[PDB]
Amino acid sequence: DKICIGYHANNSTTKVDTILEKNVTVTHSVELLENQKEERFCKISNKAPLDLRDCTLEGWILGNPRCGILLADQSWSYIVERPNARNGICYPGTLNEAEELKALIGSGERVERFEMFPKSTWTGVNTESGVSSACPLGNGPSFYRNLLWIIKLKSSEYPVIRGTFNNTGDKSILYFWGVHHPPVTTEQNALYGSGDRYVRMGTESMNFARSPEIAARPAVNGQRGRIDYFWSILKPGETLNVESNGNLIAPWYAYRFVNKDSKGAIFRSNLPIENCDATCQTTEGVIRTNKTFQNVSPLWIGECPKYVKSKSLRLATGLRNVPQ
């Protein structure tokens, strides 16, 4: 008659690491780190992301004529921009504070496109014929759909033109404008005229004034001229006054802007956007797991596990496996 005290053992070959010993076989353990992903984009909270397709984010929001599919109301959970989108800033020049603009839009949830200043706003000038071969639509020359390139009338001089918008809505307005810089004096006099020219924007809280900087530049997209693009936010209740006697790239269409109540994201990726659901969406793909860590990506939207460099984080729950 006898009784023995002992412990469980099985065919487990799963190992864990300890501080005193590595590769230790245990009876039961749990993996805390997730390394698997669906290389694609899904919906967050049943709301689809915005595909910018063959347009860069500047080209979309400025209204590059080749971005027509995107020229409408848009609602996104997050934004996907493609690495080598052809359609961006077609007419050469720098968008001022570009990075802050992308950051703002990333914090956005919805935009509503509307006509801020119709062509009839500007009197004494040519609101047509403001197109360029650098911004083609089809074969013919064209221009941005959110901007109006104004040149003087051939019969008359370029007068002081003015525009005013009272923002009476509850939503902030994202609008754009520009200043054209011809390469030589001849073009300046031909399009706008001699003497001192100016572009002046003003709101209750914003003050903007620039002059033409005529200078010879290397050709970009067949253009030795440049346009300095600018953006700003018309606060609700605020009013914008536009005043210029030349070189004005006028705001035409603008957006009613809706701020996202949480962090938004802009992913730079070639992954496909599909009609699927995800809780965790990384820039490298979807993660479906109950695990506590992932080694997939630090950039994500939604609810994801913590990012670490580890290949594995396995906690022992069971006992040291010692079969007979």
Partner: protein, 171 residues
């Protein structure tokens, strides 16, 4: 530290005990068999479940890097952002990886202590009514039926009941 039981004076485990982590093997006229210790197994499961959940619960936050961009004249704040993100990445990687090493040691030792305490719980009961073989087994100096065996597992072994019979087996 090691408690000397698991892979110690009890040299190996039992693949025959499938209903628990810790337990007994008995032999008498009514047969033999494995039986898991009901008390200590559940308590160990509750503790380890709590440990795993607590660890998960404390790791239940995330440092969220962003995809903000920087110009060529923003090299400093660009790098500032990078060293911060890499900084927290290295901290949490350190925290997770080290926690696993240290606590796996504790988890294995916890079982070791549970096995030792279970053995001592029995050894304390049987006293001189049984012969300690030193390997986790006890040979009885008396007949120990299924109910007797059962009492040992229950922790209610009646020592003076079998005391006379055990002592009265001196050859």
């Amino acid at each position: 530290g090691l408690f000397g039981a698991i892979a110690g004076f009890i040299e190996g485990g039992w693949t025959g005990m499938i209903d628990g982590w810790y337990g007994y093997h008995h032999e008498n006229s009514q047969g033999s068999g494995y039986a898991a210790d009901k008390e200590s197994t559940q308590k160990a499961i509750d503790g380890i479940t709590n440990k795993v959940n607590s660890i998960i619960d404390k790791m239940n936050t995330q440092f969220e890097a962003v995809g903000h961009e920087f110009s060529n004249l923003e090299r400093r704040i660009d790098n500032l952002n990078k060293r911060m993100e890499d900084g927290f990445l290295d901290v949490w990687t350190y925290n997770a990886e080290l926690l696993v090493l240290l606590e796996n040691e504790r988890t294995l030792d916890l079982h070791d202590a549970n096995v030792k305490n279970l053995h001592e719980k029995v050894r304390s009961q049987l006293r001189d009514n049984a012969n300690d073989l030193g390997n986790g087994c006890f040979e009885f100096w008396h007949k120990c039926n299924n109910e007797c065996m059962e009492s040992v597992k229950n922790g209610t072994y009646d020592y003076p009941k079998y005391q006379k019979e055990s002592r009265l087996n001196r050859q």
